[PDB]
Amino acid sequence: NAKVPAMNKIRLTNNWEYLKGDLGGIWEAVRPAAPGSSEAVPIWQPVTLPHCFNAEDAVDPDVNYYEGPGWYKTLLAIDNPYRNGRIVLDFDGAGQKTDVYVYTTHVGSHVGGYDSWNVDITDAVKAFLGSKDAERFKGKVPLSIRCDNSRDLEMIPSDLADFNIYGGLYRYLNLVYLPEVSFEQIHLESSLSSNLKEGILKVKTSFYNPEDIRKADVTVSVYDVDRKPVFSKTLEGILPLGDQLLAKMKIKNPVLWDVDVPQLYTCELTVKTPDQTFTTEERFGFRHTEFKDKGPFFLNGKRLLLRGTHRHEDHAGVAQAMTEDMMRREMRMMKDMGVNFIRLGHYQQSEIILDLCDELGILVWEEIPWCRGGLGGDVYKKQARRMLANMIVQHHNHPAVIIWGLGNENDWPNDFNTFDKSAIRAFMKELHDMAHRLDDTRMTAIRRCEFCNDIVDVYSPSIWAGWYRGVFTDYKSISEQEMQKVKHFLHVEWGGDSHARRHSEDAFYNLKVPRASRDGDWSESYVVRLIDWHLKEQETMPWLTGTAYWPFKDFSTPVRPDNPVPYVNQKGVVERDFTPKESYYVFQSYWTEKPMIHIYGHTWPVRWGGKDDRKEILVYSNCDEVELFVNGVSQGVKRRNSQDYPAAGLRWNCVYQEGMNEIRAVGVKKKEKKEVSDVIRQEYQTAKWDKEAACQVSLLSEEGDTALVQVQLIDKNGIRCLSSKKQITFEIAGDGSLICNLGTSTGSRKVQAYNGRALIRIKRNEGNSVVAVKSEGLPTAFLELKSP
């Protein structure tokens, strides 16, 4: 399968209908139906693409997310601009098994939720438009597509995985018109000498030529980052059939691709016949990479500590159906945090993501979804083989990619009643060998399958210091031991869960030490210190290739119904809606140079303790020195120093006054000659609280048609229970509706309290509603919401 190298892609976003469930046969999608008839049910839902079956039910706290069939239908207005041209449906990606129909004709199918693929529907379209059936469709072509994400033990990935195996047309679906002769595949194979002074580019192509044209003229042109030609060659009378090597060239003193200054060349290809001129473009970059034996990673001859994260294709409100603009925002957000490396979750991701990594300067590890459970039969193995080949062939032109991953946690059993380590080793080695045959210039890898750690080029164990294992102060020691076991060690996945907006006084060094092991309270306060510690240690590990935090952004998973946000993995440093957590700024203060400054506690409204306690205040900043003010009184300047943990020396112990406090931080970064500041306001409560006794519910603010409701757990005397984690359940009756099923701690109708509180927004619909608030063992509370 391929992504189609085309210039004229039409995204089919509008005028779709979606049915959750199965039809009795293709005839049900296209048969005549009168209003009010038996054919007029089931009732379909109008939607736009991309669309995911699971946009809401993945994080709905009371249901298993839907795994099963669903249908889409639309009417295509066909108008091919090319004489005797082709009509192609090009799928960026669809989950998980897809069948495609033109009227009643099955035209294509696909198994695999994460690779790109396409279907040539030229003949089906011509036959339909020439048939008696075209008339009642008014000259349009009925397109019906079935997607299915039914559970399937003989299909990867496994339902044991810690993520949703989503369904639907959740990546763009494109209508692509082609001339008679086009390119089926374009491989831009480039290499760079060790001394960086000579680049080699090989331009290989496969032709798409169903009309069996015998000759064409093909022009290959290569342009540099400034759009200047560096090579141009026309091949007259070439045979445009199957594979052809078009050009091999040497480029002296190439512009290099780098994570700080990503620079790309552009290859432009034209196919000419008497009846067509067709041009497309493909980008590539020159760069040299090397993993040292028992040592670090080098990019273009310089040691580069990989500063990595992960991401899932998942987002608030849409699940996997993210748009291009959402992807652009998220990747920019990563770059602004200082990320230079990403493992793209457990599957091939949208080509849009790969382009953004090429453009932003982010190295890529990308893997096939052989993720837990063991090993299935022949259909299973063919899928893994097919998805690995599809991934390498589809993404090999991207300079960001340095690692093809072959699987994750393959030592995790129980999708089958046997677990055969030797068979897993055998299939693993077959995939490794196949990847090296397809692309000898990149490394293979796996994560966490020790009995396969001799097979791949690059290996990652499981090291979650301070979360699943020991204390986070063991991080460096464990890494040193682990790195000794394999030729090339690279650490993917570490961190900890934090319930966004939950903070903990016990996690701080308050006067009048905090443990470094999993905070059973899942506070941001603990994860911040855990990340701080990891980043400080990495500055003293010169042998270290690098690491990748897991994940960048909170994402939904079916195996955690009981998390503070149900069905959400909360290890992210960013909320599922892009809202940064406190931990985002720790990475940013360590990994970027643009001046910034962040007092911890922007979402911490009420601290607590004894009167005149000296409360710890942390500032995460890359400034050379910072001065803290508490209620206008300077608390002293402090100099930044990574090794002075925590907060790299920028910590203070200060008395808060009862009631409201204002904390201000002023920083200077000498290199930039820049001053930056931050300010937060925090209340300080000295009253102690008894057991939770009631929910106080009130209107916190309004914006347009929207109301922000706040819930506070209080004891029998009305004192805030600032440590409570009790689950709050929201219900509504009336004209409004809850803004929920977003997978965030402020967009959930069932959510654990954060320091005794919970927030949710109500869409009022310009009418009247009553909100009810439940919590186990407490009286149900109520709030009326009227509109102006």
Binding region for K ion (CB under 5 A): 60, 65, 567
Q: CA of 523: how far to CAs of 272, 517, 631, in Å?
A: 63, 12, 26
Window 45-84: contact mask with a second copy (x via CB under 8 A): -------------------x-xxxx---------------
Supply the angle between the helices 351-360 and 324-336 in degrees, to the nearest 10: 30
Q: Which is nearer to Na ion, 152 or 715 (CB)?
A: 152
Instruction: Find the shortest distance in angstroms from Cβ 55 to Na ion.
Output: 21
The token pair that represents 108 in the structure block: 């294509």
CB contact at 8 A, 396 and 187: yes
In whole angstroms, what is the distance from residue 721 CA to residue 700 CA?
18
Instruction: Find the shortest distance in angstroms from Cβ 749 to K ion.
Output: 12
- Residue recorded with tokens 């692509």: 176
Instruction: Identify which range of 16-24, 110-118, 583-591, 751-759 contacts a second copy by CB under 8 A.
Output: 16-24
The reply to whether 788 sits near a second copy by the rule CB under 8 A is no
Residues of this chain that bind ligand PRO (CB under 6 A): 188-190, 284-285, 397, 399, 441
The reply to whether 772 sits near a second copy by the rule CB under 8 A is yes
Q: Which is nearer to ligand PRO, 248 or 716 (CB)?
A: 248
In whole angstroms, what is the distance from residue 77 CA to residue 27 CA?
21
Instruction: Find the shortest distance in angstroms from Cβ 202 to ligand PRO.
Output: 8
697 binds, among K ion, ligand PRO, Na ion, none (CB under 5 to 8 A by kind): none
List 162, 411, 624, 683, residue binding a second copy (CB under 8 A):
162
Instruction: Find the shortest distance in angstroms from Cβ 432 to a second copy.
Output: 7
Q: Is position 575 annotated as part of the catalytic site?
A: no
Instruction: Find the shortest distance in angstroms from Cβ 139 to a second copy.
Output: 20
Q: Which is nearer to a second copy, 153 or 606 (CB)?
A: 153
537-558 burial by CB neighbour count: b if 16+ within 10 A, else e? bbeebeebbbbbbbbbbbbbbb
First to last CA, the chain: 56
SS3 377: coil
Amino acid sitting at position 25:
G
639 binds, among a second copy, ligand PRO, Na ion, none (CB under 5 to 8 A by kind): none
399 prior amide bond cis, ω within 30: no
SS3 423: helix
List 123, 224, 430, 482, residue binding a second copy (CB under 8 A):
430
Residue whose CB is nearest to ligand PRO in the complex, by number: 284
Residues in a beta bridge with 72: 18, 145
The DSSP call for residue 425 is H
Instruction: Return all residues near 704 (Cβ < 8 A) that are at least 6 apart.
Output: none
User: % helix / strand / coil in the chain, to the nearest 5?
Assistant: 15, 40, 45
779 binds, among ligand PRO, a second copy, K ion, none (CB under 5 to 8 A by kind): a second copy
For residue 199, which phi and psi values (nearest 5 degrees)? -110, 140
Instruction: Find the shortest distance in angstroms from Cβ 218 to Na ion.
Output: 38
Distance of CA 35 to the CA centre of its chain: 43
Q: Which is nearer to a second copy, 102 or 647 (CB)?
A: 102
The reply to whether 375 sits near a second copy by the rule CB under 8 A is no
731 binds, among Na ion, ligand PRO, a second copy, none (CB under 5 to 8 A by kind): a second copy
In whole angstroms, what is the distance from residue 535 CA to residue 606 CA?
29
| 81, containing H or E segment | none
99 binds, among a second copy, ligand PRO, K ion, none (CB under 5 to 8 A by kind): none
Amino acid sitting at position 65:
Y
Neighbours of 206 (CB within 10 A): 17
In whole angstroms, what is the distance from residue 343 CA to residue 548 CA?
7
In whole angstroms, what is the distance from residue 136 CA to residue 50 CA?
28
Residues of this chain that bind Na ion (CB under 5 A): 152, 155, 158
List 299, 435, 455, 618, residue binding a second copy (CB under 8 A):
455
Please tell me which residue in 409, 575, 582, 627 is annotated as part of the active site. 409
With CB under 8 A, what is the number of residues at the site for a second copy? Answer: 78
Residues with their C more than 2.5 Å from the N of the next written residue in the chain, i.e. before a break, are: 512
Q: Which is nearer to K ion, 7 or 559 (CB)?
A: 559
Contacts to a second copy from residues 711-740, by CB under 8 A = 731-735
Q: CA of 474: how far to CAs of 109, 311, 480, 586, in Å?
A: 50, 26, 10, 20
* Helices (H), ranges, 539-616: 582-591
155 binds, among Na ion, K ion, ligand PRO, none (CB under 5 to 8 A by kind): Na ion
Q: Which is nearer to a second copy, 23 or 478 (CB)?
A: 23
For CA atoms 14, 15, 21, 23, give the dihedral sign.
negative
In whole angstroms, what is the distance from residue 742 CA to residue 507 CA?
28
120 binds, among Na ion, a second copy, K ion, none (CB under 5 to 8 A by kind): none
Instruction: Find the shortest distance in angstroms from Cβ 706 to K ion.
Output: 25
The token pair that represents 784 in the structure block: 């009326």
Contacts to a second copy from residues 219-248, by CB under 8 A = 239, 241-243
The token pair that represents 582 in the structure block: 């406190």
Contacts to a second copy from residues 504-563, by CB under 8 A = 558-559, 561-562
Instruction: Find the shortest distance in angstroms from Cβ 50 to K ion.
Output: 20
229 binds, among Na ion, K ion, a second copy, none (CB under 5 to 8 A by kind): none
Window 123-152: contact mask with a second copy (x via CB under 8 A): ---------------------------xxx
In whole angstroms, what is the distance from residue 439 CA to residue 204 CA?
13
List 6, 75, 78, 153, residue binding a second copy (CB under 8 A):
153
42 binds, among K ion, ligand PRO, a second copy, none (CB under 5 to 8 A by kind): a second copy
For residue 465, which phi and psi values (nearest 5 degrees)? -65, 130
The DSSP call for residue 673 is T
Q: Which is nearer to K ion, 309 or 563 (CB)?
A: 563
For CA atoms 478, 480, 484, 488, give the dihedral sign.
positive
Q: Which is nearer to ligand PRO, 395 or 720 (CB)?
A: 395
* Residue (of 402, 405, 372, 399) closest to 387 by Cα position: 405
Q: Which is nearer to a second copy, 305 or 707 (CB)?
A: 707
- Residue recorded with tokens 């803290």: 628
List 38, 195, 253, 484, residue binding a second copy (CB under 8 A):
38
Instruction: Find the shortest distance in angstroms from Cβ 92 to a second copy.
Output: 26
| 437, containing H or E segment | helix 421-438
Instruction: Find the shortest distance in angstroms from Cβ 418 to a second copy.
Output: 10
Instruction: Identify which range of 225-233, 301-309, 336-344, 432-440 contacts a second copy by CB under 8 A.
Output: 432-440
Q: Which is nearer to a second copy, 152 or 358 (CB)?
A: 152
Instruction: Find the shortest distance in angstroms from Cβ 400 to ligand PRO.
Output: 8
Q: Which is nearer to a second copy, 11 or 425 (CB)?
A: 425
Instruction: Find the shortest distance in angstroms from Cβ 646 to a second copy.
Output: 32
682 binds, among Na ion, ligand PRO, K ion, none (CB under 5 to 8 A by kind): none
Q: Which is nearer to a second copy, 237 or 610 (CB)?
A: 237
List 6, 9, 15, 22, residue binding a second copy (CB under 8 A):
22
In whole angstroms, what is the distance from residue 787 CA to residue 657 CA?
38
Q: Which residues are catalytic?
A: 409
